[PDB]
Design a binder for this molecule. Structure first.
Ligand SMILES: NC(=O)c1ccc[n+]([C@@H]2O[C@H](COP(=O)([O-])OP(=O)(O)OC[C@H]3O[C@@H](n4cnc5c(N)ncnc54)[C@H](OP(=O)(O)O)[C@@H]3O)[C@@H](O)[C@H]2O)c1
Ligand SMILES: Nc1nc(=O)c2nc(CNc3ccc(C(=O)N[C@@H](CCC(=O)O)C(=O)O)cc3)cnc2[nH]1
Ligand SMILES: [Mn+2]
Ligand SMILES: [Mn+2]
Ligand SMILES: [Mn+2]
Length: 159
């Protein structure tokens, strides 16, 4: 099973200038809980944005060019990325925009955080078709001293 996990600001913005400009510790904690002990697939730009391997997860990087760091696994196509995960129950695709576009048709589950923040961005989450997806979990949180925007954790499963 393939799942996508992402945090979306208003208008599906997910990034600006190869960064995420907000800071929501509760959402990073949610990301860690839902990805720990699973393989994570990411594109090269997102690998450069994170800047280090994510511990406790098999890190698989998509790039058309040879890898430059043997602490992670480098692959050259979507099919190779999936194969490199082996026989696991759940593969987590962690972006960015181009990678999400390619894996969306193959995904059965979306873990989405909707952040009430207006962000200028240059990268968006793919338009998906709402009729294809059932919301099976949602949990709203107001802003607090640690998290400066309200946010909504949602899990959707392909109908
Ligand atoms: N809010 C969130 O949840 C979230 C999550 C992840 C990322 N982001 C943000 O998203 C932005 C980065 O997204 P992005 O769309 O620019 O880039 P991306 O999807 O992270 O990376 C694109 C790169 O991945 C490689 N790639 C993708 N598909 C491939 C394929 N089929 N075969 C081989 N290589 C492939 C290529 O690398 P080469 O050029 O080396 O071939 C391509 O240039 C950043 O702003 C980041 O902060 C946000
Ligand atoms: N909901 C969601 N939020 C995100 O921030 C997110 N980020 C990415 C890609 N970028 C990043 C950037 C930083 C870290 C990171 O530092 N993660 C730590 C945080 C642990 C914690 O704060 O409790 C980790 O070990 O996962 C992960 C992914 C992909 N999907 C996401 N999905
Ligand atoms: Mn092929
Ligand atoms: Mn197999
Ligand atoms: Mn806000």
């Amino acid at each position: 099973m393939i799942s996508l996990i992402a945090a979306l600001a208003v208008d599906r913005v997910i990034g600006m200038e190869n960064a995420m400009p907000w800071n929501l510790p509760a959402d990073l904690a949610w990301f860690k809980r839902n990805t720990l002990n699973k393989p994570v697939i990411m594109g090269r730009h997102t690998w450069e944005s994170i800047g280090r391997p994510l511990p406790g997860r098999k890190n698989i990087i998509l790039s058309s060019q040879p890898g430059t760091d043997d602490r992670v696994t480098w692959v050259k196509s979507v099919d190779e990325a999936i194969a490199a995960c082996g026989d696991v129950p759940e593969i987590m695709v962690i972006g960015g925009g181009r990678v999400y576009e390619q894996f969306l048709p193959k995904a059965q589950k979306l873990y989405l955080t909707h952040i009430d923040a207006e962000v200028e961005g240059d990268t968006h989450f793919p338009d998906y078709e709402p009729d294809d997806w059932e919301s099976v979990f949602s949990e709203f949180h107001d802003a607090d001293a640690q998290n400066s925007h309200s946010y909504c954790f949602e899990i959707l499963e392909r109908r």
